[PDB]
Design a protein around this ligand. Structure first.
Ligand SMILES: O=C(CO)[C@@H](O)[C@H](O)CO
Ligand SMILES: O=C(CO)[C@@H](O)[C@H](O)CO
Ligand SMILES: O=C(CO)[C@@H](O)[C@H](O)CO
Ligand SMILES: O=C(CO)[C@@H](O)[C@H](O)CO
Ligand SMILES: [Mg+2]
Ligand SMILES: [Mg+2]
Ligand SMILES: [Mg+2]
Ligand SMILES: [Mg+2]
Ligand SMILES: [Mg+2]
Ligand SMILES: [Mg+2]
Ligand SMILES: [Mg+2]
Ligand SMILES: [Mg+2]
Ligand SMILES: [O-]
Ligand SMILES: [O-]
Ligand SMILES: [O-]
Ligand SMILES: [O-]
Lengths: 387, 387, 387, 387
């Protein structure tokens, strides 16, 4: 009944289930979860692996002595359970020294510090076997306009990612980076607000081949955009190295609801797309069990995630296979969208009088697109009202 | 008293002042303005030139006979007044044959037609002397998810812009293109929603050098982003070929208010940036005098535009020159932002123990950024409360 | 298979299916539909009745002669089909004389005119048998701040509704009014933006008993609010005389998609509420078939509406009846929410030391709310994944 | 040079300047400020008084012994400086026992507890001399739909405010309550989201006369509404007992920027309104110095607040007095808006043939409103470009 298996590629962040529940207007409602503990409960539910921030596994300020002790206990846990670690990131947002940013902070000294803190937790990412490395520059921005020269910051940002590449290139690591956009929160405005702004940025770096994106549901939905639309340009441009799943009800604070929640009609068009294009990386889940819940609630919430994906995957599978849905698509000319417009060459088109001088625009404009039917059909499938 | 002169580069679209006032819920409140008429009133107010859609100058369905008559009358007008035409575009949104799009429409035949309609009004753009050519794909999108394969559409979009380049390359024209993003309205979702999404798209075309952007105030402010932030990546990436100025009060229908209106604190940080980076192209104005106004109102509204830019330009000039503002900037370390972080090389940084092993993070984090003062200063300048 | 019958109370506006497709950036894509024609197709699909604007049935400027001819043809149509007319409204937004508003316009003369135009189409509303009368003040607002004294406008608004009541009171009509809020579009800001702002306004009129609300899905969802939350205060306060159903994808232009579309998880919590509280009025549908469609598309789109309501009604019915959903509710204490907090009186509470001096706050705060389970359950029901 | 004096009525919350800087994604960047310390620095800058949450002055869990010690030290501070305390509130959001709400929480026991916690800090509000008492129900809402019966919650909410009134009525206190709306954050959706939703709620309580509102800038601007528009209905309905000033850049997390910041054109239309209607209560400031700042920054940020109000007050004063602005207003008929529409009675209007049968609608619709000029004038005044 929609049971998950490691072969599904469902992964979680230690900081997701582990969220203690502290929000601007409230203290923590839950007690700390030990990383080994999250790992057994997850493996048990049907996951594949887990992701982490340096600061999640190794507490800030930890000596290299205690630092070994947390990596061994984790190491052992991964083995007794079989879980994997296909992605890792740095924590350049919590500590106060990052109040103005990491790679883009004004204090030059603060920038160097954040470049090392990363390089350090990259040697560990590999040591464990992570394939992708993500970077979320949440403290990279400004509330006021004279606080940041956006042109100077974009320089300090390319210089940061470049160095990192030169490092992985020398260290002959097979790892690749994933830049995660957010339009805002915790800064008034964040650098590289959406997938689009990050994709362009990557075509300016020295080694573009080593960079991609890790678009998150709610984040793109914080600017009011169509998430699936955005996962399309990344794939079209071959840059979807990773993805963060969750829920978001519109434009407002980053909610991070469990997957399926929020915009349900949208999560249906994402799975479909991810299945069609053959996305094989991990189906990550960057969510936060609400603070009105306890631990039995955190595990139910993380169960709902995978389960919602599985059903949606099914309901989408049928959608495409339905012999009737297939003819509606032809009725709406999605087959003609796939066909090149001018494979006949420019010259051919400039002389072809069927495209202008003789085109019957009136007869053509009267041709209905039949989009409302193909949708209600889609709707019956998601609800399971077809039969 | 803030009088404009053609040397300011203020330009307008024939369809701006000429707007008749028809909105979804209302008939037109103003009568049609003849293009020659807009041209004399504008030259009179202190402008430099005007932009246009093929359909603005040459009514849809016009024979090549009447078509010559509108280009001559315009031609003569430009001369008796001295106005110039530094930008031109096609109209792929009004006619019903474009209900599903132009370059990305599903009906292949509709795509070819829209490629020619453009190529035609490109030969005219040059004939007049336009330097830039803009493209706004407003009908390029979908309301439902199965209505468009976003990967197939991005193919038909690259194929469209490519052909156009092959054409201008053969026709040895010195013109360049400008893709204008919009996140939505009139379609539920529009392809290449923001500046970011268009910048990445341009690095995939065959001839990237011939493409740029024409970001519009309200449009980026329809997704809730920081406009100036966005004009920074375009400049940083050298792609600001043109720009559309106007006003927008938040997230909602595209208002197109006169310049200065809407977010005033933002229009102050844009002019400053445009002046600093030395933006020399035109200061275009894509606005719509509200329908509660008559013609004396349309001319006052177009007067307010340039005037607001001029004052803002002044108030920003003083801001930067103020000896006190200059030391606040140093106080907030914008001078250190400009300084490279690791010109000493990767190796130097990996050994430099001043950046990690010995960095005093606590002492550094206690260092205030002093951003609130530099802003109130900025605020006094905009209001003119410094003295 | 989710077939509707007049006993469902599904109604439509003549201006919904009849929409010709003209948007700010496009001419009409469909031809005019004659009112009698909409009436036969609708009765055929399974409806109960239709609503209208004076201007929909009787074209603006029509003489009392032709005016009788449109009311007779309509009259006859209603009979050959059995359809009813349970609601009617005035059209104070299209004509240019309403560019500054109707009841709140500055030109005093324009206000009187709009008061009569209404009183006229009220005598007709009854003549036909409408039970409710709706008022949408879309042109009541301003783009600029000095354009309207909001205190003076609220006076001219109470004076407008008052007079109307004095009229229906004298004409001994059994009709009641329904004020429909919108936060914006076509004006920069609209008076009485949300349900809340209209509910308060009604408690100031002379005859409050004769007024209520007609909240529309997308409209409240244009400000980013929770629609069902809003339909709750209206019912709690006994003011839901009518309702407009449709779809809206977030914050942006008013889409008016068919019902079910947009936020699907929200339309599930609305039907449930409407069924629980026993809402018996009409399940109106104020939507707009998209302009990429033709007539076969307009009828399919209006079919999807009712169908989506029917399924959602079912999936919600099961939800509540599920013996398991019932114990989850008890698990989450919705039964304790219904229980009064201090029926024991103030004094009893001030002495009751179980509520403060001895309350164990720590033990109580540790009590999980179990909300994530009751939701995934809800989710399985909507998708039909329970079994 | 825009210096404030207690006669201006500028007040602050202890929790504003005192904010330590902890946000969802970051630890505190500033150290704790002692209440007596905030009081001396504020009195020094030019304030009138300060507001507080029980939990700000008396730490949660404090014994009645230490509880006296904090009220005496505060008491003395107020005297050595002369500051006043015209408003006080309870803290029903931080502690975890309020994770599901206070007055509306499901656990009945949690509701009683929160009713007492309030009644307690009301006896103290008076003891000090506060005139108004505010209530912000931030934890009153839900993320999921089955988590809360919105009809049951509105019952538990009226029962809460009622009891409080019965208490102040018996305790013969001269105090009055102020309900502060927020559409969201920290809950997915909050009960009584906007000023409108709270105004209606007040007309259902047992003792309406004892209730009002305390609208906050950013909060109403979180739903995308026009703040000044909203302060107009409250005044029109005589319910503006208090107000919270600050800044907010659009729709997103609650920023709480210093006053003047965010939407500057809007803060100009608010002061004008507050000055015209003769608002005499306090000009409260509920803001948060950003966490990139230290203490010298917190005092500069709180200086900018009052200063921005003072200038805006001036620039607005001139606006109204300008002989030219006065004739523009007449030109735009704001004088006719103030004039009653039908003081002649219903009958008079029904017979008056100048309002319909003979009204020249075409001649009337051609009458421009001249709104764009009156605005550019307004703009010149705010910038100080008139002369
Ligand atoms: O996206 C967020 C928060 O909005 C983070 O969890 C990143 O994924 C990791 O830095
Ligand atoms: O931006 C718009 C409308 O939102 C257009 O005026 C383009 O500039 C021209 O197609
Ligand atoms: O709501 C709208 C448009 O947003 C109207 O159809 C009203 O229902 C009738 O005036
Ligand atoms: O408005 C907020 C936070 O958004 C509070 O500071 C209230 O004023 C007090 O509970
Ligand atoms: Mg997030
Ligand atoms: Mg994430
Ligand atoms: Mg625009
Ligand atoms: Mg434009
Ligand atoms: Mg609508
Ligand atoms: Mg409606
Ligand atoms: Mg706030
Ligand atoms: Mg507040
Ligand atoms: O997140
Ligand atoms: O535009
Ligand atoms: O509507
Ligand atoms: O706040």
């Amino acid at each position: 009944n929609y049971q998950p298996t490691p072969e599904d590629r469902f992964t979680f962040g230690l900081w997701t289930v582990g969220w203690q529940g502290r929000d601007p207007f409230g203290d923590a409602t839950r007690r700390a979860l030990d990383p080994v503990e999250s790992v057994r409960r997850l493996a048990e539910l049907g996951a594949h692996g887990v992701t982490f921030h340096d600061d999640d596994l190794i507490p800030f300020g930890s000596s290299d002595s205690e630092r070994e002790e947390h990596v061994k206990r984790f190491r052992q846990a991964l083995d007794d359970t079989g879980m994997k670690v296909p992605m890792a990131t740095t924590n350049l947002f919590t500590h106060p020294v990052f109040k103005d940013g990491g790679f883009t902070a004004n204090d030059r000294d603060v920038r160097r510090y954040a470049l090392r803190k990363t390089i350090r937790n990259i040697d560990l990412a590999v040591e464990l076997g992570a394939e992708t490395y993500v970077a979320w520059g949440g403290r990279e921005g400004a509330e006021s306009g004279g606080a940041k020269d956006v042109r100077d910051a974009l320089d300090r940002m390319k210089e940061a990612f470049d160095l990192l590449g030169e490092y992985v290139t020398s260290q002959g690591y097979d790892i690749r980076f994933a830049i995660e956009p957010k339009p805002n929160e915790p800064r008034g405005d964040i650098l590289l607000p959406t997938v689009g702004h990050a994709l362009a940025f990557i075509e300016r770096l020295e080694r573009p081949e080593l960079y991609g994106v890790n678009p998150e549901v709610g984040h793109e939905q914080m600017a009011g955009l169509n998430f699936p639309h955005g996962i399309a340009q990344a794939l079209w441009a071959g840059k979807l190295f990773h993805i963060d799943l969750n829920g978001q009800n519109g434009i407002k604070y980053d909610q991070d609801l469990r997957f399926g929640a929020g915009d349900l009609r949208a999560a249906f068009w994402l799975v479909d797309l991810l299945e069609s294009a053959g996305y094989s990386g991990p189906r990550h889940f960057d969510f936060k069990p609400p603070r009105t819940e306890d631990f039995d609630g955190v595990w139910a919430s993380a169960a709902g995630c995978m389960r919602n994906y599985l059903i949606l995957k099914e309901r989408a599978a049928a959608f495409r296979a339905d012999p009737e849905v297939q003819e509606a698509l032809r009725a709406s000319r999605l087959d003609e969208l796939a066909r090149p417009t001018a494979a006949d060459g420019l010259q051919a088109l400039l002389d072809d009088r069927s495209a202008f001088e003789e085109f019957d625009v009136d007869a053509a404009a009267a041709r209905g697109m039949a989009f409302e039917r193909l949708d209600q059909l889609a709707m019956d499938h998601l609800l399971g009202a077809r039969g």
